Specification:
Keywords: [2FE-2S] protein, crystal reduced with dithionite, electron transport
Order of helices and strands: EEHEEHEEE
Shape: globular
Name: ferredoxin I
Bound molecules: FE2/S2 (inorganic) cluster
Assembly: monomeric
Entry title: anabaena PCC7119 [2FE-2S] ferredoxin in the reduced and oxixized state at 1.17 A
CATH class: Alpha Beta
PDB class: electron transport
């Protein structure tokens, strides 16, 4: 499957539509398609690449920084998140979390 992922940067008021394989991380696909996004460790261990879901689901089982309450609130570490549906996600959300 290949899922439609919509990246929303609220502070800048931008929207980008990308297509992400079910076996590729969202951040990697975004970059390949010309859309740079924040990151540092690329290993699910910091919050630099955090996003927040608007709709849809991800598999971010490789992540280790976010706690269960943050996951239930919709936060996602985009560097280790595979889409499992079409997704709409707000990017640049780390400031929510520090
Ligand atoms: S860049 Fe560190 S968790 Fe994603």
């Amino acid at each position: 499957a290949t899922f439609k992922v919509t990246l929303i940067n609220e502070a800048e008021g931008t929207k980008h539509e990308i297509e992400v394989p079910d076996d590729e991380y969202i951040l990697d696909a975004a970059e390949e398609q010309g859309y740079d996004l924040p990151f540092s460790c690329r290993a699910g261990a910091c919050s630099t690449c955090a996003g927040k879901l608007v709709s849809g689901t991800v598999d971010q089982s490789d992540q280790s920084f976010l706690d269960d309450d943050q996951i239930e609130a919709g936060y996602v570490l985009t560097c280790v998140a595979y889409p499992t549906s079409d997704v709409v996600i707000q990017t640049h959300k780390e400031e929510d979390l520090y």
